[PDB]
Design a protein around this ligand. Structure first.
Ligand SMILES: O=C(CCc1ccc(O)cc1)N[C@@H]1[C@@H](O)[C@H](O)[C@@H](CO)O[C@@H]1O
Ligand SMILES: O=C(CCc1ccc(O)cc1)N[C@@H]1[C@@H](O)[C@H](O)[C@@H](CO)O[C@@H]1O
Lengths: 364, 364
């Protein structure tokens, strides 16, 4: 798994080198603030990408970027493009129309994209966590799962389905991918046991109304701030973390950012730590409800957030509390939540870029 | 598109007429009370089946039924078995391990089934709604969708994905199947835009904790009765309807069973009617929340209950109220709930038997 990030110029020069004299997949991982776009080739995977700023905060700006690449890149390179797959930070329909976005305006339309980078019949727009799910599969496919994912706790069902150690393979069962970052992303890597095939199913779990436990007052406190029935993302996100911190300090310390709160928690600050426990309590509730609804074999937490918050999961008291909340469901009296193995990304890797490429394989 | 229930001996006879001198698919629709098993052949879908009482109330009695069938049947008939698929009223893993079940006792195990009816590599056990979802596909493939399904309302997304009228085909989009009957069943017919294929993913939406709207007291009341945080099935089931009717009458009238309540409502009783609106209010919350989480193109309400309570859905007032509640979600401010086309089964049909066959065709 190799990704190199280059200026657009160094990018152009890299693609003229012998190693890149080969069929290419155009890929793009588009976020609310930036996009990484470039080319990917083949059991190792090799991507070379350049970073763009989404300064105009508008999804149509990608069209301008694609043009730039086509004009600035030699035709010899562009003609090697066998497939073109990008991902965007919002719901996508028909792999062709993405929108509406929370942090960008406009609608991503595959039909308005240049066929030089998006060949007809071999092109797709993915949801970011749909690409991430494909990304998880690409890690598994390269026999390197244990290098990127660590077991948080092993579920009851793993040994029933798998002889190998937890975390060593994705496993022949449904894998629910959760990404608590800017937005709360989710996807279901469904497993069809009749053909032994994994299939990525995009979800919007973050946007469901939170069902209560013994926390009606806490939920109502947020309800009154937002003037909206809180959804999971409202508790599990940067603003969620900031909310949890305000609720812990109650005025006594002025507000700081989610980023600042995460830093303080890394330094042992009791208030920030408790905010972080709160944030994860709600993440574990997404997990327990989804564990029932989707009956997954595994749940995998992914993203730079998860990797960088390793200090939090490393702590056995934090981990035991998350485990307890994961089991906090009425259906656990039948063992449903206990079936599931939870894993977390433990090493940095842009799953989305790998996923766009992995998806391109299935179009080609 | 037809199914004749026959006696065991006159099943054996029926399977000698020349029209049934074809490869056969063994199928079985296992309910809590009765199981219908038999054989299927082909635009045209012809099935003939015999019924068994599940009077051991034990899922394992099936093997005796299987054994009997093979004993009381020609080797000219058994030799034409190409596939074998049955469905059961509980979760199933690996398409081969069914249960534990809320209704029956034991575990359905494909490995303990006779290969004469279940040719290895061409057989499966399905969850009941997993089969239902396959049945919905089969109806659509037989170009007879509009004969069995009526539109309750057309969603915003339909005319952009399909040029055919709503209700006339399943549609090239995800279809969430809900079966609000004795239990609450749910499955997602996922549409894969990469390869234009539908796949059926089993769900357990019924067992999710109910998120609130403005009904905290009503939920607390049931919570106190059940001594369990209510899930959608608690509000949307037989037990659910009985609860709604009781909260309506407040001991002013006698307590009535679900069937009693249903009948009374059809006759025009105001209290029973109020109970059924209450029930459908919670059914619509399953739909609005799943509309966000799973982003379906359609939602199809299936089952005998649904056909038999056609009177309820035909009332323009009840339907308007259902529609209103289907859009009662904070995400509707973005049009998410409005995207979805709702349909209901309007004519009797064992989708599950048809589903077992349709599944079989993917297995051969
Ligand atoms: O933003 C949403 C909900 C839909 C929505 C659309 C417009 C809007 O203004 C408000 C919400 N969903 C996205 C989701 O697609 C993505 O996978 C996730 C991780 O990046 O962040 C958000 O959860
Ligand atoms: O069985 C369950 C949930 C697990 C469960 C286990 C024990 C129990 O007492 C209660 C529920 N769910 C099943 C589901 O598989 C099925 O499709 C649906 C329609 O028949 O009925 C049930 O709701």
């Amino acid at each position: 798994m190799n990704i190199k990030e280059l200026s657009l110029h160094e990018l152009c020069e890299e693609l003229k080198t012998p190693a890149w004299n080969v069929p290419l997949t155009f890929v793009g991982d588009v976020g609310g603030t930036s996009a990484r776009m470039g080319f990917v080739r083949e059991d190792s995977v090799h991507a070379c990408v350049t970073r763009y700023s989404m300064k105009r905060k508008d999804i149509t700006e990608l069209i301008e970027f694609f043009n730039e690449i086509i004009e600035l890149m030699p035709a010899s390179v562009i003609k090697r493009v066998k497939a073109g797959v990008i991902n965007v930070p919002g719901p996508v329909t028909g792999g062709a129309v993405g929108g509406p976005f929370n942090n960008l305006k406009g609608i991503a339309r595959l039909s308005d994209y240049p066929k030089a980078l998006f060949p007809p019949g071999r092109s797709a727009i993915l949801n970011d966590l749909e690409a991430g799910g494909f990304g998880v599969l690409a890690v598994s496919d390269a026999h390197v799962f244990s290098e990127y994912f660590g077991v948080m706790w092993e579920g009851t069902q793993w040994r029933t389905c798998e002889q190998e150690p937890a975390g060593s393979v994705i496993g022949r069962g449904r894998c629910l991918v959760l990404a608590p970052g800017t937005g709360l992303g989710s996807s279901l890597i469904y497993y069809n046991p009749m053909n032994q095939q994994h299939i990525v199913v995009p979800l919007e779990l973050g946007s469901q109304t939170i069902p209560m436990r013994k926390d009606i007052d806490y939920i109502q406190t947020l309800h009154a701030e937002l003037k909206l029935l809180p959804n999971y993302e409202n508790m599990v996100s940067g603003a969620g973390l900031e909310f949890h911190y305000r609720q812990v300090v109650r005025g006594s310390r002025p507000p700081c950012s989610a980023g600042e709160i995460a830093k303080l928690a890394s330094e042992g600050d009791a208030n920030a730590c408790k905010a972080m426990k709160k944030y994860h309590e709600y993440l574990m509730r997404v997990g327990s409800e989804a564990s029932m609804a989707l009956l997954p074999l595994t749940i995998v937490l992914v993203g730079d957030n998860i990797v960088n918050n390793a200090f939090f999961y490393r702590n056995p008291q934090n981990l035991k509390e998350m485990h307890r909340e994961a089991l906090n469901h009425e259906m656990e009296r039948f063992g449903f939540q206990s079936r599931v193995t939870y894993l977390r990304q433990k090493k940095l890797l842009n799953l989305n870029l790998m996923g766009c490429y992995r998806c391109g394989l299935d179009l080609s």
